From a paper:
Holo-SrpI (CyD loaded) was generated by denaturation of the purified SrpI shell protein and re-folding the shell protein in the presence of CyD as described in the previous section. Cryo-EM analysis was performed on purified holo-SrpI to resolve the shell structure at 2.2 Å resolution. This represents the first Family 2 encapsulin structure and is the highest resolution structure for an encapsulin to date, allowing for accurate atomic model building. Interestingly, the A-domain of SrpI that forms a pore at the fivefold axis is composed of residues that are positively charged, in contrast to the negatively charged fivefold axis pore of Family 1 encapsulins. Unfortunately, during processing and classification, the holo-SrpI encapsulin proved nearly indistinguishable from the apo-SrpI control. The inability to resolve significant portions of the cargo density may be due to low occupancy, or conformational flexibility of the cargo, which disappears at higher resolutions when many particles are averaged together. However, symmetry expansion and focused classification of the holo-SrpI encapsulin, guided by the 225-NTD-sfGFP-SrpI dataset, revealed additional EM density at the interior surface of the shell that was localized to the three-fold symmetry axis. While the cargo EM density was too weak to accurately build an atomic model of the cysteine desulfurase cargo residues, we were able to determine which shell residues likely interact with cargo density based on their proximity to the putative cargo EM density. Of note, shell residues at the threefold axis neighboring the cargo EM density are highly conserved, which suggests that the interaction between the encapsulin cargo and shell may be conserved. Namely, residues F262, and Y273 are located near the suggested cargo density.
Author numbering:
A (entry chain A): 54 to 58, 77 to 105
B (entry chain A): 8 to 58, 77 to 305
C (entry chain A): 8 to 58, 77 to 105
D (entry chain A): 8 to 53
E (entry chain A): 106 to 210
Amino acid sequence: QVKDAFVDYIDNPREYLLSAVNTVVDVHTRISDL
Amino acid sequence: LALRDVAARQLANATKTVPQLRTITPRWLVRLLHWTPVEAGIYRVNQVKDAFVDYIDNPREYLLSAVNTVVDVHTRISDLYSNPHDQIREQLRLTIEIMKERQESELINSREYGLLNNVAPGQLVHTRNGAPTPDDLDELLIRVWKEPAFFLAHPQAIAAFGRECTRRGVPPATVSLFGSSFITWRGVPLIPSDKVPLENGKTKILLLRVGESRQGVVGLYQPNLPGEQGMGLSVRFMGINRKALASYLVSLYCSLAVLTDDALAVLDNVDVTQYHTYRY
Amino acid sequence: LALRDVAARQLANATKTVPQLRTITPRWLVRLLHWTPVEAGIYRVNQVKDAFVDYIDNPREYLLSAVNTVVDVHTRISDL
Amino acid sequence: LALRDVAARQLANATKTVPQLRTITPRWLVRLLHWTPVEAGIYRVN
Amino acid sequence: YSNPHDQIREQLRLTIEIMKERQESELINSREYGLLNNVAPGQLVHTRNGAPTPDDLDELLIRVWKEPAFFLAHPQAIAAFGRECTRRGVPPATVSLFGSSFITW
């Protein structure tokens, strides 16, 4: 970001960390086989 | 006043190194050994009895040993942070480095195989006065007089031998091997290894002949492994658990055989803490 | 006196058979049956009722059954 | 519990070395000498 | 029992190894031929003080000054000569022959 919009930048910019959402899908082998 | 360095640095890509592992050693012994493949994990060393020609009926069989390590990497870490460095590859690389260090230490110190425990009677020499003098290494060379390959010693023991050579006014020669310089005694190089035990300033020095053509020391490994990444080394994907941790199995199969008993000698009671006082 | 058999045998490769399983049978019935594929595990056998021509409305449905066995082999055994 | 190592080893071929003879030496003198053939077993040095 | 190793060939190989060792020992020690018994008068040197010092090997080199090829010694005698060289502060040089290192004087 430009600070207080000479041209200076802020020294503590926000860093966005990607988040993880996990789901485990359990399927019995006989169900998918049959 | 103008744009400052700390603010302009927020736009700059930092150059990131791979993680530095300080316990990595050159592992000279593994590079100096001759390696024999054992296709089914059993190495039987047949011997002539009391060298008509008869063989012994109970030859030693060497079973290759397995060392396993599980490498757990969270799937989100390898998914998110693998640019520009593969996270799984770095974890595996480092894991294999540590396992190779352990393998060298086992080639020296194992209780089943392992040079310091498979030394024959009559091949164990003792220092006359503690410090590793030229005479003690000459004794070692008496024991392995048939084409000796190299000495193996702790770097402090190599320094102590150098001090003993300096006190006697003898500069030992050096050779270049693998782009590195090594002290030699009577043309036999002194190879450093920090896996040789050193406790209370007391260590040991080994002398080896290597190879199957000669009847020397050989390393043993398993040649055809699933997921093979190196000599006797394999990496397998184990699966992912419920908490999204991916596991990898690192396996190392290795052993060591001393084919004849005059291929190895050990100098015992080496003292590395003695310093001469030069007065003139 | 010369080289003995027990000592010379230390140099010889033994011929190893696969493990013999004595409970194996020819299993003639399986070889004599006719085998019908069921693509989705359900086999409905329709029947003529009291053999105009009518069919029963509650035919038997055969559900294929599953028998599972887990085979554990240590990685070092298959490696070595 | 699963298949054990001692039982699985009954299926494995052992690698057998030739018999090791510890009294073998490099015999440097024979390799360093010059060897002269004598066709009829008699060598007369004049 | 000749799979994978020929039994006759191994027996013969080992037998020939033992005979070659005996042959080297006879080249050194035989009573008819044999270097230690076919030494001329004037070519037999004695150590001045027991141990094989540099001066004794210099005497030997006096006796065979015309293009000498090599010394032949027991490995313990080579170690004793090395100890005598170390006591005098002399490191002897080494050569490579047949892929092996040897002390030279």
